[PDB]
Design a binder for this molecule. Structure first.
Ligand SMILES: O=S(=O)([O-])CCC[n+]1ccccc1CCO
Length: 105
């Protein structure tokens, strides 16, 4: 359990099949059950990328990390009232550093 852990940073990730995190912090997750998470958001002022460790038995941003067992971080759209974002989780080393915006691969 070893993840990029910069929390929410500005990003230029847009209109590409995959993105790097460009996060310089790689952390040992505090608890062994934790997985890596990436969250991509765009509003009319900026794009951000959030990278953390998170326990997948706990919701994150009001969603369950159903993909926690995956070695790769495959972005999927999350829609709630007021906000749409993209999120993925994964459980291989620094896997939230290689963020894939496709299911084609
Ligand atoms: O802002 S949007 O509504 O179009 C969602 C964009 C989703 N997204 C984010 C970042 C990189 C790539 C993609 C899609 C693949 O090109």
């Amino acid at each position: 359990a070893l993840c990029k852990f910069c929390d929410v940073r500005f990003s230029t990730c847009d209109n590409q099949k995959s993105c790097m995190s460009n996060c310089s912090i790689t952390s040992i997750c505090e608890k062994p059950q934790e997985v890596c998470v990436a969250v991509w958001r765009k509003n009319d002022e900026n794009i951000t990328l959030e990278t953390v460790c998170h326990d997948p038995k706990l919701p994150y941003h009001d969603f369950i990390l159903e993909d926690a067992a995956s070695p790769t971080c495959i972005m999927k759209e999350k829609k709630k009232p007021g906000e749409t974002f993209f999120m993925c989780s994964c459980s291989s080393d620094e896997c939230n550093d290689n963020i894939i915006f496709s299911e084609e691969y």
